[PDB]
Amino acid sequence: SPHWQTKLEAAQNVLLCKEIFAQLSREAVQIKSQIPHIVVKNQIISQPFPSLQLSISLCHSSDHLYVLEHNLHLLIREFHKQTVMPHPASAPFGHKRMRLSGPQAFDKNEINSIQSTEGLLEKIIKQAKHIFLRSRTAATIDSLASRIEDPQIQAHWSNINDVYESSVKVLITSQGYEQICKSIQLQLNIGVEQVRVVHRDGRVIMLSHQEQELQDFLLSQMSQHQVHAVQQLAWQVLSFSNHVGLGP
Amino acid sequence: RAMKIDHLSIEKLLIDSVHARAHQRLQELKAILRSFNASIETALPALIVPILEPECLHIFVDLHSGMFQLMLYGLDPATLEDMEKSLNDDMKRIIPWIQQLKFWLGQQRCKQSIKHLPTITTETLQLANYSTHP
Amino acid sequence: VTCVSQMPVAEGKSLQQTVELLTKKLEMLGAEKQGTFCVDCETYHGKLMYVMHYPLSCFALFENGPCLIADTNFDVLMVKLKGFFQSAKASKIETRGTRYQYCDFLVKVGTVTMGPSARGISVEVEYGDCWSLLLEFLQSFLGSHAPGAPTVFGNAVYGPADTMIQYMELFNKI
Amino acid sequence: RNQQLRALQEECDRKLITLRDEVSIDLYELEEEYYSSSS
Amino acid sequence: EVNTATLCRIGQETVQDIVYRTMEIFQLLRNMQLPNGVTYHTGTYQDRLTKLQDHLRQLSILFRKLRLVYDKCNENCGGMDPIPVEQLIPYERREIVEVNKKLKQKNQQLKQIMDQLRNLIWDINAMLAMRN
C-alpha cells in the first residue's frame, strides 16, 4: 500500500479534526445559556444533566467509536449542504425552501425549515438518549432480578432507531400464558424530554430521569387485570373487580 | 484553589480566575440562603439550592460571562428564564422566585401523582359566581 | 384550512372597549400569546392594495388574485409599474391587531384600518366543510354574529386570499 | 472514481443493513427465548 | 417413570388444543366458497380439503390419547384413594434442588451473555442510525 498517500490522508483527517474542534469550541463559547459546559484548550466536557460527563476529547501526538463517526458525518453533511443545487433560473441561488413560502404560506414552518442549531447540542442529546436507554435497561434488569417470583415482564426493542429517539414494546408475559396479554406498553424514549408511554388507554405520561415506579404500578394493576382475565377463562365471575376501592 | 501555575496555558489562567470568582459569588449566595433559611449543598462546577425537604432547581454560573442562569429538571420555559434574567440584572428579587418555585413543586408533584390515574387537572373552576362558600 | 372570518360591529360602550371585552373573553377561553400579525387593509383600485399579513402579504387584483410571489416581489412589481397600473390614489388604510393561538386555532382581531372600521375576528382551521367544531367554537365565542359562509365547501383548495379580499370589501360599509 | 466509490459504499451499506436485519431477527428470537424463563 | 402430573398437564394441553383445533376448523370452513367462483377451481380447494383431512385425523388421534390418559388417571387411584385435601385446600430432594441451583446459575451466566449480545445489537442499530 502507498505510504505517502495514507500519510497525506491522515494529515487531511487531522486537519479537518482541528477545524471541527475549533468550530465546536466557538459554538460552546458563543452559545446562549441553554446549558453550562467545560471548555479547555484540548479537552471538552458538558453537563446537560447530572451524571452526564460526556468524555469527548481531541487527541494528538504531543459508543466508544460510533458517536465520533456520527459527529463527523453530521458536520460533513452540514458542510455539504452549505455547498443541493439551487435550481436557479433568474438568480435564486438559494434553497427551494426559501421560495416555498411564496405559494405555500408558512407562518413558522419556513422559520423552522431555514436553519437550526446543531453540533454540540445534537451529540449531547444523543448521549442523553443513550443514558436513557441505559436507565431503561437497568430498570428492566432490576425488575428481573427483584420481581423474579413476580410475573416476568418481557420487553422487545424496536428496529428503526432514529437519530434522536427509539421505542420498546413491553408486556407482562405471565409464566406460560399467552392469553394473559392484557397490557402492552409502548415507550418511545428520546433525549428531547421525558419518555411518553402508552399501555392500553392513551394515557400520555412523562416520568423523571430516576422515576421508574410507574413500571411497578403497571405491573400490579396488570397482575390484577390478568387474574380477572383468567377468571374469565375458567366460573364466570363478572367484571366487578376494579383497581382500588378507597385503599385497603 | 488559588492556582498560580507558570504559564501552562492562558486558558488555565482564565479557569483559575473565573473558578475563584464564581466560588466567591456562590458562597455569597449560600450565605444569603443560610441567612433566610436554616441547609444547602455545594459542588465543584456549581452549587445546589434545595427546595424540598423529603432533587431539582440547580444553580450554575457562566464560566465566560456574568448573568449566571439557572435551570431545573422541570418545566416552565420562557418564564424561569425571565426570572433568572431579572435575578442577574438585580440580584435583589430572589426570594419571590423561591416561593414561586415552592408553589411550582407543590403543584407539579400532585400533577405527576394524578397523571397515571384517570384525572383532569386545571388552574381554577373559572366560575366565581357563587363566591361565598369557597 | 382556510377558515371563516367575520366582523361583529358592536357598539354601546366603545370600539376599543368592545375590542378589550372580546380579548378578555378570548383570554378566559384560554387564548395563548402568539404575537401580533397585524394585517393591514389598504385600497387603491379592478385591482386592489391588500397589505394583510400568514407571514406574507399580497393584493388580489381579480379572480381572487394569484399574488403567489413574496411581498418584496409584489412591491417591486408595483413600484416598477408606477402609473402603468390603474390602482395609487384611493385611500391607503391599514388594519392592525394581535394574533393569539389558543390551541391549534389562531384568532386575529383586525382593528380599524383607517379608524372607521370594525374588529374582524379571523380563525384558522387545521385541515378543512368542517364547520362542526367551527360553529361549536363560534357560538361559544360570540353571540348573534360570525355568519361567514365564504366561497368554501364547494368541492380551489382552501383559498385564504379570496376570503381576505371579501373581508376588505367591507370598505364601502362605512 | 466518484461513481466507483459510491457503488462501493452502497454495497457496504447494503451488507451492513442486511447484517442488522439478520441480527434483529436473531435478537428477537433470543430475547423471546430468554424472557420466557426467570431464574 | 410415573410422570403422572406431567400426564395430567398433557391432558389439559390436549383438550386446549382440541378446542383450538375446533376454532381453526371453523375458521377454515367459513372461507370455503363456491368451487368455480373466480379461480380456485381445485387447487386451493383440494389443498384445504387435505388440510382439513389432516386436521380431523389429528383430532381423532387426540381424542384417542385423551381417552387413554383419562383411563390412566382413573386407574391411577392407588393408595390414598379418597384424599380429601381437595375440599381441605390449605388456607433425594436435595440433589434435585442442587441441580436446579446449578441450572439457574448457568442460566444467569447465559443471561449475562445475552445481555452483552443485545448490547452489541443495540450498538449495531445505533450504527445503522448513522447510515445513509
XYZ file of C-alpha atoms in Angstrom:
727
model
C 0.000 0.000 0.000
C 1.156 3.555 -0.749
C 2.727 5.086 2.347
C 2.840 8.791 1.474
C -0.759 8.533 0.260
C -2.190 7.319 3.566
C 0.117 9.795 5.310
C -1.461 12.645 3.342
C -4.910 11.206 4.053
C -4.269 11.126 7.801
C -2.921 14.672 7.506
C -6.158 15.839 5.897
C -8.041 13.937 8.605
C -6.225 15.629 11.468
C -6.608 18.987 9.711
C -10.383 18.627 9.468
C -10.442 17.354 13.058
C -8.665 20.505 14.233
C -11.109 22.566 12.169
C -14.182 20.927 13.692
C -12.687 21.191 17.179
C -12.246 24.927 16.656
C -15.829 25.095 15.386
C -17.255 23.261 18.400
C -15.202 25.480 20.710
C -16.549 28.624 19.044
C -20.056 27.191 19.376
C -19.653 26.335 23.064
C -18.326 29.817 23.804
C -20.808 31.742 21.621
C -23.911 29.724 22.597
C -26.663 31.008 24.881
C -27.352 29.823 28.442
C -29.067 26.611 27.289
C -26.565 24.509 29.264
C -23.217 25.006 31.035
C -20.092 23.228 29.861
C -16.335 22.975 30.374
C -14.021 24.077 27.559
C -10.258 23.519 27.789
C -7.555 24.016 25.159
C -7.907 20.380 24.069
C -10.428 18.587 26.337
C -14.155 19.345 26.205
C -16.932 18.192 28.516
C -20.506 19.360 29.059
C -23.233 18.660 31.594
C -26.825 18.832 30.295
C -27.980 16.925 33.396
C -26.462 15.143 36.409
C -24.352 12.068 35.664
C -23.545 13.270 32.128
C -19.747 13.504 31.906
C -19.509 13.238 28.119
C -15.909 12.163 27.514
C -15.269 13.511 24.027
C -11.697 14.707 23.593
C -9.335 15.784 20.812
C -6.229 13.592 20.995
C -2.924 14.200 19.232
C 0.684 13.007 19.354
C 2.054 15.595 21.775
C -20.428 4.206 21.592
C -16.649 4.174 22.001
C -16.306 4.772 18.242
C -19.811 5.270 16.837
C -20.569 8.695 18.305
C -17.458 10.281 16.790
C -18.271 8.829 13.372
C -21.794 10.202 13.767
C -20.463 13.655 14.652
C -18.056 13.655 11.705
C -20.779 12.570 9.294
C -23.220 15.191 10.567
C -20.682 18.007 10.318
C -19.570 16.976 6.837
C -23.220 16.707 5.776
C -23.700 20.218 7.157
C -20.789 21.433 5.039
C -22.114 19.553 2.001
C -25.486 21.263 2.423
C -23.685 24.592 2.813
C -22.101 23.950 -0.585
C -28.155 20.631 -3.276
C -28.174 22.830 -6.361
C -30.425 25.908 -6.064
C -32.064 25.203 -9.450
C -31.574 28.862 -10.429
C -33.443 30.421 -13.338
C -33.214 34.218 -12.945
C -30.999 34.356 -9.837
C -32.327 32.366 -6.840
C -29.013 30.764 -5.834
C -30.551 29.510 -2.594
C -32.751 26.652 -1.430
C -36.237 25.732 -2.622
C -37.429 26.055 0.981
C -36.978 29.824 0.634
C -39.237 30.090 -2.414
C -41.736 27.583 -0.990
C -43.036 30.248 1.410
C -44.371 32.236 -1.550
C -47.063 29.857 -2.798
C -47.332 27.806 0.403
C -47.816 30.224 3.295
C -45.618 29.198 6.235
C -46.130 31.234 9.404
C -43.496 29.368 11.426
C -42.700 26.363 9.210
C -40.396 28.375 6.943
C -38.630 29.778 10.014
C -38.125 26.239 11.303
C -37.177 24.910 7.851
C -34.494 27.558 7.255
C -31.755 26.640 9.737
C -31.334 25.391 13.294
C -28.685 24.920 15.966
C -26.597 21.756 15.887
C -23.134 20.404 16.622
C -22.613 20.080 20.359
C -26.337 20.074 21.164
C -27.147 17.162 18.857
C -24.323 14.991 20.191
C -25.340 15.948 23.733
C -28.946 14.897 23.218
C -27.736 11.712 21.518
C -25.774 10.913 24.669
C -28.945 11.767 26.586
C -30.848 9.188 24.542
C -28.039 6.726 25.262
C -28.199 7.252 29.021
C -31.993 6.988 28.866
C -31.683 3.631 27.112
C -29.163 2.576 29.752
C -31.556 3.578 32.540
C -34.403 1.677 30.877
C -32.212 -1.420 30.590
C -31.211 -1.020 34.239
C -34.857 -0.776 35.293
C -35.628 -3.933 33.321
C -32.685 -5.778 34.886
C -33.696 -4.638 38.372
C -37.249 -5.857 37.782
C -35.953 -9.199 36.504
C -33.624 -9.701 39.470
C -36.080 -8.478 42.119
C -39.528 -9.278 40.711
C -38.419 -12.764 39.673
C -41.204 -14.579 41.517
C -43.442 -11.828 40.152
C -44.705 -12.137 36.560
C -41.571 -11.973 34.424
C -42.005 -8.812 32.368
C -40.781 -9.180 28.781
C -39.533 -6.338 26.578
C -38.524 -6.053 22.927
C -36.681 -3.153 21.325
C -37.736 -1.611 18.024
C -35.790 -1.674 14.754
C -35.915 1.778 13.096
C -33.671 3.556 15.585
C -33.794 7.198 14.522
C -31.102 9.803 15.133
C -32.701 11.034 18.375
C -35.346 8.556 19.583
C -36.310 4.889 19.647
C -39.029 2.699 21.137
C -39.560 -0.562 23.012
C -42.685 -2.710 23.336
C -43.032 -4.439 26.705
C -45.651 -6.792 28.118
C -46.456 -8.642 31.325
C -45.798 -12.162 29.981
C -47.104 -14.310 32.802
C -45.434 -17.702 33.195
C -46.770 -19.837 30.356
C -49.944 -17.925 29.475
C -50.320 -16.288 26.065
C -53.942 -15.370 26.841
C -52.829 -13.001 29.628
C -51.827 -10.311 27.131
C -53.860 -7.628 28.901
C -51.382 -4.730 28.730
C -48.718 -3.761 26.184
C -46.656 -0.655 26.942
C -45.026 1.149 24.012
C -42.301 3.517 25.230
C -40.730 5.988 22.808
C -37.546 7.149 24.516
C -35.900 10.409 23.453
C -33.414 12.881 24.871
C -35.684 15.801 23.998
C -37.944 15.351 27.038
C -39.326 12.623 29.291
C -40.369 9.314 27.755
C -44.051 9.019 26.825
C -45.571 5.565 27.338
C -48.993 4.158 26.440
C -50.209 0.732 27.555
C -53.917 0.413 26.752
C -55.560 3.783 27.452
C -53.741 6.504 25.524
C -52.707 7.949 28.892
C -49.845 10.166 27.745
C -47.378 10.222 30.642
C -43.919 11.571 31.436
C -41.586 10.162 34.090
C -38.365 11.634 35.515
C -34.713 10.748 34.994
C -34.766 8.432 38.035
C -38.517 7.734 38.277
C -39.453 4.142 37.471
C -42.204 3.238 39.966
C -44.758 3.640 37.163
C -43.447 0.317 35.861
C -44.238 -1.337 39.201
C -47.688 0.281 39.319
C -48.448 -1.022 35.837
C -47.095 -4.397 36.987
C -49.513 -4.554 39.917
C -52.566 -3.312 38.024
C -51.803 -5.675 35.141
C -51.461 -8.567 37.574
C -54.973 -7.615 38.680
C -56.271 -7.410 35.106
C -54.620 -10.773 34.433
C -56.279 -12.545 37.342
C -59.540 -11.008 36.102
C -58.988 -12.304 32.567
C -58.006 -15.799 33.707
C -61.090 -15.882 35.920
C -62.966 -15.070 32.720
C -61.065 -18.029 31.247
C -62.215 -20.608 33.797
C -66.906 -19.854 36.712
C -67.862 -16.551 35.077
C -67.192 -14.032 37.870
C -68.211 -10.730 36.291
C -66.101 -7.588 35.881
C -66.995 -6.073 39.280
C -63.273 -6.104 40.165
C -61.957 -2.542 39.935
C -58.471 -1.125 40.508
C -58.617 0.098 44.120
C -61.654 0.871 46.258
C -60.861 3.584 48.836
C -57.498 1.930 49.539
C -57.056 -1.153 51.711
C -7.878 26.581 44.756
C -5.806 29.728 44.159
C -3.826 28.193 41.310
C -0.753 30.159 40.212
C 0.732 27.937 37.512
C 3.660 29.236 35.457
C 2.051 29.717 32.034
C 0.963 26.152 31.439
C -1.942 27.665 29.469
C -3.663 31.063 29.432
C -6.852 29.010 29.358
C -5.780 27.576 32.712
C -5.402 31.139 33.999
C -8.932 32.007 32.887
C -10.163 28.811 34.550
C -8.436 29.746 37.807
C -9.783 33.308 37.807
C -13.367 32.517 36.829
C -13.484 29.498 39.151
C -12.328 31.643 42.073
C -14.759 34.500 41.444
C -17.589 32.035 40.816
C -16.904 30.183 44.062
C -16.864 33.581 45.772
C -20.288 34.628 44.500
C -21.613 31.100 45.070
C -20.541 31.176 48.718
C -22.191 34.601 48.861
C -25.480 33.142 47.614
C -25.123 30.209 50.015
C -24.660 32.653 52.894
C -27.753 34.525 51.690
C -29.725 31.272 51.725
C -28.420 30.409 55.198
C -29.490 33.892 56.290
C -33.003 33.241 55.009
C -33.384 29.537 55.814
C -31.677 27.398 58.464
C -29.265 23.806 54.853
C -27.891 23.616 51.298
C -25.253 21.748 49.302
C -22.180 22.701 47.284
C -20.153 21.124 44.470
C -17.114 21.963 42.349
C -18.549 23.151 38.994
C -21.615 24.762 40.592
C -23.760 24.595 43.734
C -27.244 23.305 44.524
C -30.128 25.033 46.302
C -32.768 22.671 47.750
C -36.482 23.436 47.567
C -37.992 20.267 49.110
C -37.387 18.608 52.485
C -38.130 14.865 51.957
C -33.960 16.887 43.521
C -34.190 19.879 41.178
C -33.563 23.647 40.990
C -29.811 23.571 40.396
C -27.942 26.874 40.152
C -24.859 27.367 37.983
C -22.611 30.163 36.761
C -21.466 31.367 33.358
C -17.773 30.497 33.122
C -17.251 33.074 30.364
C -19.630 35.927 31.270
C -21.891 37.225 34.009
C -25.621 36.533 34.224
C -25.405 33.166 35.951
C -28.536 31.479 34.617
C -30.382 28.643 36.346
C -32.120 25.507 35.109
C -34.135 22.735 36.742
C -35.129 19.232 35.650
C -38.665 20.568 35.352
C -40.693 22.784 33.059
C -41.970 26.363 32.540
C -39.617 27.745 29.873
C -39.524 31.434 28.904
C -40.637 32.183 32.495
C -37.847 30.679 34.582
C -35.503 32.290 32.053
C -37.056 35.707 32.675
C -36.799 35.151 36.432
C -33.101 34.334 36.123
C -32.557 37.342 33.848
C -34.166 39.631 36.424
C -32.027 37.959 39.094
C -28.834 38.592 37.128
C -29.864 42.197 36.487
C -30.932 42.970 40.074
C -29.606 40.266 42.471
C -32.211 41.514 44.997
C -35.570 39.997 43.973
C -34.605 36.400 44.689
C -36.965 35.084 47.410
C -40.215 35.755 45.456
C -38.989 33.358 42.786
C -38.068 30.968 45.605
C -41.685 30.980 46.778
C -42.863 30.697 43.170
C -40.702 27.584 42.763
C -42.093 26.255 46.048
C -45.618 26.577 44.650
C -44.309 25.091 41.400
C -43.013 21.932 43.063
C -46.182 21.708 45.138
C -48.363 21.689 42.037
C -46.083 19.549 39.864
C -45.860 16.807 42.492
C -49.635 16.397 42.675
C -49.989 16.708 38.897
C -47.479 13.903 38.337
C -49.144 11.929 41.135
C -52.574 12.201 39.486
C -51.309 11.681 35.929
C -51.421 7.871 35.981
C -54.920 7.730 37.483
C -57.922 8.978 35.464
C -57.893 12.698 36.237
C -58.065 16.119 34.577
C -56.358 18.999 36.371
C -56.865 22.716 35.785
C -55.961 26.114 37.207
C -59.356 27.152 38.585
C -63.069 26.474 38.222
C -63.333 29.758 36.248
C -66.804 30.268 37.797
C -66.647 32.798 40.646
C -70.398 33.486 40.629
C -71.107 31.765 43.961
C -68.054 33.384 45.556
C -69.416 32.983 49.081
C -68.672 29.440 50.303
C -65.258 28.770 48.665
C -57.531 25.078 6.076
C -58.935 28.461 5.046
C -61.279 29.099 7.956
C -64.129 31.589 8.147
C -63.924 35.130 9.498
C -66.442 37.886 10.190
C -66.682 41.254 11.947
C -69.395 41.760 14.590
C -69.802 45.540 14.620
C -70.631 46.145 18.277
C -71.473 49.497 19.849
C -72.741 50.986 23.096
C -69.547 51.197 25.133
C -66.780 51.935 22.592
C -64.803 50.331 19.790
C -61.689 49.907 21.935
C -63.902 48.818 24.838
C -65.543 46.146 22.683
C -62.114 45.020 21.470
C -60.890 44.737 25.060
C -64.021 42.807 26.047
C -63.549 40.365 23.167
C -59.882 39.946 24.098
C -60.810 39.282 27.729
C -63.400 36.710 26.656
C -60.792 35.005 24.472
C -58.258 35.002 27.313
C -60.894 33.467 29.583
C -61.308 30.861 26.851
C -57.546 30.316 27.119
C -56.087 32.366 24.266
C -52.308 31.931 24.418
C -49.995 34.758 23.381
C -48.869 34.294 19.772
C -47.655 37.727 18.695
C -49.490 40.384 16.705
C -49.788 39.539 12.999
C -51.341 42.907 12.212
C -52.989 42.540 8.798
C -53.361 45.881 7.042
C -56.138 46.747 4.598
C -55.150 49.353 2.011
C -57.119 50.433 -1.023
C -56.018 51.647 -4.456
C -58.103 50.478 -7.431
C -60.399 46.388 -10.665
C -57.187 45.750 -8.747
C -56.559 46.346 -5.039
C -53.858 47.200 -2.491
C -54.259 44.387 0.036
C -51.465 44.605 2.618
C -52.819 41.984 5.019
C -50.278 39.621 6.573
C -49.773 34.470 7.190
C -46.122 35.611 7.095
C -46.578 37.037 3.587
C -48.823 39.679 2.030
C -50.344 40.125 -1.416
C -53.005 42.125 -3.244
C -55.784 40.283 -5.091
C -56.335 42.010 -8.432
C -59.119 39.709 -9.642
C -60.083 36.042 -9.894
C -59.228 36.006 -6.166
C -55.788 37.201 -7.247
C -52.762 35.000 -7.880
C -50.462 37.020 -5.581
C -48.244 33.957 -5.199
C -44.972 35.915 -5.047
C -43.270 37.204 -1.920
C -44.123 40.660 -0.607
C -40.851 42.110 -1.911
C -41.515 40.882 -5.452
C -45.041 42.313 -5.355
C -43.808 45.674 -4.056
C -41.115 45.754 -6.745
C -43.709 44.995 -9.421
C -45.885 47.790 -8.035
C -43.103 50.389 -7.873
C -41.894 49.398 -11.347
C -45.338 49.851 -12.910
C -45.793 53.185 -11.136
C -48.772 54.592 -13.022
C -48.691 51.722 -15.523
C -51.412 50.150 -13.342
C -54.874 51.585 -12.730
C -54.627 51.039 -8.938
C -52.132 54.684 -6.463
C -54.845 57.151 -5.432
C -57.514 55.522 -3.317
C -57.468 55.649 0.470
C -54.494 53.668 1.824
C -55.705 52.312 5.172
C -54.029 49.771 7.466
C -55.744 47.472 9.956
C -53.898 46.042 12.947
C -54.359 43.784 15.962
C -52.978 40.785 17.847
C -52.988 37.084 16.969
C -53.473 34.508 19.734
C -53.141 30.742 19.250
C -55.427 29.171 21.854
C -54.818 25.531 20.898
C -54.231 24.694 17.216
C -56.570 27.619 16.473
C -55.234 31.099 15.762
C -57.543 34.084 16.242
C -56.706 37.514 14.825
C -58.540 40.772 15.526
C -58.404 43.086 12.529
C -58.841 46.534 14.044
C -59.972 49.787 12.410
C -57.900 50.284 9.260
C -58.479 53.999 8.646
C -60.212 54.441 12.008
C -63.790 53.841 10.886
C -63.996 50.033 10.819
C -64.865 47.026 12.960
C -62.696 44.337 14.583
C -62.871 41.312 12.301
C -62.357 38.013 14.117
C -60.379 35.639 11.892
C -59.807 31.985 12.778
C -57.594 29.348 11.146
C -58.569 25.702 10.622
C -56.146 22.762 10.622
C -57.160 20.608 7.638
C -60.599 21.600 6.334
C -66.677 21.943 5.035
C -65.502 21.246 8.598
C -67.946 23.563 10.363
C -68.882 21.350 13.328
C -66.084 22.478 15.635
C -66.073 25.832 13.830
C -69.688 26.521 14.793
C -69.277 24.973 18.248
C -66.481 27.465 18.911
C -68.143 30.454 17.236
C -71.343 30.095 19.263
C -69.322 29.724 22.475
C -67.170 32.707 21.454
C -69.666 35.388 20.366
C -73.416 35.871 20.083
C -75.622 36.504 17.048
C -72.710 37.047 14.673
C -69.973 35.228 12.719
C -72.106 34.091 9.763
C -69.096 33.640 7.488
C -70.105 31.346 4.615
C -67.195 32.136 2.263
C -66.665 30.651 -1.201
C -65.873 27.395 0.592
C -67.387 23.902 0.817
C -67.689 23.878 -2.978
C -65.724 20.670 -3.564
C -59.698 25.857 -5.428
C -58.234 24.264 -2.284
C -58.747 26.358 0.873
C -58.139 29.791 -0.601
C -57.231 32.375 2.031
C -56.690 35.374 -0.249
C -60.245 35.283 -1.605
C -61.541 35.392 1.966
C -59.199 38.293 2.730
C -60.499 40.194 -0.299
C -64.056 39.506 0.859
C -63.182 40.944 4.269
C -61.531 44.003 2.718
C -64.695 44.504 0.652
C -66.182 45.942 3.875
C -64.664 49.319 2.938
C -67.926 50.592 1.426
C -69.783 49.519 4.586
C -68.795 52.846 6.172
C -13.554 7.283 -9.127
C -16.566 9.062 -7.625
C -19.031 6.623 -9.184
C -16.834 3.639 -8.291
C -16.533 4.582 -4.628
C -20.228 5.482 -4.484
C -21.065 1.969 -5.671
C -18.593 0.556 -3.142
C -20.115 2.431 -0.207
C -23.599 1.496 -1.419
C -22.611 -2.181 -1.380
C -21.081 -1.744 2.076
C -24.223 -0.059 3.409
C -26.381 -2.809 1.908
C -24.263 -5.515 3.537
C -24.351 -3.719 6.891
C -28.127 -3.275 6.696
C -28.645 -6.945 5.847
C -26.417 -7.755 8.823
C -28.576 -5.544 11.034
C -31.767 -7.219 9.831
C -30.435 -10.730 10.429
C -29.113 -9.721 13.850
C -32.525 -8.182 14.559
C -34.324 -11.446 13.833
C -31.714 -13.203 15.971
C -32.067 -10.791 18.895
C -35.853 -11.045 18.801
C -35.634 -14.842 18.877
C -33.095 -14.968 21.702
C -34.863 -12.295 23.762
C -38.150 -14.177 23.460
C -36.374 -17.382 24.484
C -34.714 -15.627 27.425
C -37.614 -13.637 28.878
C -39.732 -16.813 28.938
C -37.695 -18.054 31.923
C -36.749 -16.307 35.170
C -34.056 -17.776 37.408
C -41.439 -43.424 35.149
C -44.762 -42.260 36.586
C -44.952 -38.774 35.015
C -48.478 -38.511 36.409
C -48.586 -34.751 36.993
C -46.995 -34.252 33.582
C -49.637 -36.622 32.196
C -52.452 -34.512 33.650
C -50.818 -31.366 32.280
C -50.552 -33.077 28.890
C -54.243 -33.950 29.021
C -55.136 -30.351 29.839
C -52.970 -29.113 26.971
C -54.590 -31.711 24.707
C -58.136 -30.578 25.459
C -56.998 -26.972 24.985
C -55.551 -27.989 21.616
C -58.831 -29.740 20.779
C -60.707 -26.502 21.449
C -58.194 -24.509 19.403
C -58.437 -27.003 16.537
C -62.223 -26.690 16.651
C -61.809 -22.927 16.328
C -59.343 -23.472 13.480
C -61.576 -25.873 11.551
C -64.470 -23.438 11.886
C -62.293 -20.554 10.673
C -61.185 -22.687 7.715
C -64.726 -23.848 6.950
C -66.148 -20.318 6.869
C -63.816 -19.436 3.971
C -64.791 -22.319 1.680
C -66.643 -20.542 -1.121
C -68.094 -21.958 -4.328
C -65.589 -24.044 -6.331
C -65.966 -22.269 -9.678
C -66.147 -18.815 -8.128
C -63.279 -16.964 -9.787
C -60.088 -19.032 -9.970
C -59.872 -21.534 -7.081
C -61.089 -24.423 -9.234
C -59.497 -27.395 -7.475
C -56.031 -26.303 -6.375
C -56.718 -24.360 -3.197
C -59.937 -26.366 -2.892
C -58.241 -29.770 -2.736
C -55.436 -28.165 -0.718
C -57.758 -27.116 2.099
C -59.591 -30.434 1.719
C -56.385 -32.318 2.509
C -55.699 -29.748 5.236
C -58.991 -30.467 6.995
C -58.448 -34.193 6.407
C -55.186 -33.981 8.344
C -56.998 -31.803 10.891
C -59.632 -34.463 11.536
C -57.068 -37.270 11.631
C -55.035 -35.331 14.200
C -58.179 -34.572 16.199
C -59.118 -38.259 16.189
C -55.639 -39.195 17.414
C -56.025 -36.508 20.078
C -59.354 -37.971 21.193
C -57.700 -41.396 21.346
C -54.931 -40.019 23.557
C -57.500 -38.196 25.699
C -59.406 -41.428 26.301
C -56.107 -43.161 27.079
C -54.954 -40.531 29.574
C -58.399 -40.467 31.192
C -58.283 -44.242 31.651
C -54.752 -43.914 33.041
C -55.826 -41.235 35.524
C -58.761 -43.419 36.564
C -56.527 -46.465 37.064
C -54.013 -44.253 38.900
C -56.250 -44.343 42.013
C -53.859 -46.495 44.008
C -53.135 -45.697 47.638
C -54.736 -42.746 49.449
C -57.749 -43.064 47.169
C -60.127 -40.559 48.885
C -57.510 -37.862 49.580
C -59.989 -35.274 50.938
C -57.456 -32.429 50.627
C -59.464 -31.251 47.601
C -62.108 -29.664 49.818
C -59.415 -29.307 52.517
C -57.156 -26.994 50.491
C -54.859 -25.026 52.837
C -55.872 -21.554 53.957
C -33.426 -37.044 47.416
C -34.944 -33.583 47.035
C -31.576 -32.062 47.973
C -29.951 -33.364 44.784
C -32.812 -32.002 42.674
C -32.574 -28.632 44.431
C -28.809 -28.520 43.858
C -29.254 -29.387 40.177
C -31.846 -26.609 39.981
C -29.422 -24.168 41.608
C -26.656 -25.094 39.164
C -29.113 -24.740 36.280
C -30.165 -21.290 37.490
C -26.509 -20.286 37.824
C -25.781 -21.382 34.256
C -28.952 -19.545 33.239
C -27.717 -16.353 34.898
C -24.397 -16.743 33.084
C -26.204 -17.172 29.768
C -28.384 -14.198 30.723
C -25.299 -12.017 31.108
C -24.062 -13.370 27.768
C -27.382 -12.463 26.144
C -27.186 -9.040 27.787
C -23.808 -8.457 26.155
C -25.209 -9.749 22.858
C -28.213 -7.423 22.944
C -25.962 -4.527 23.951
C -23.908 -5.215 20.831
C -27.141 -5.455 18.835
C -28.321 -2.067 20.109
C -24.890 -0.701 19.220
C -25.229 -2.055 15.673
C -28.685 -0.486 15.467
C -27.076 2.791 16.528
C -24.529 2.431 13.725
C -27.344 1.881 11.240
C -28.948 5.042 12.597
C -25.850 6.810 11.263
C -26.262 5.137 7.870
C -27.280 6.864 4.645
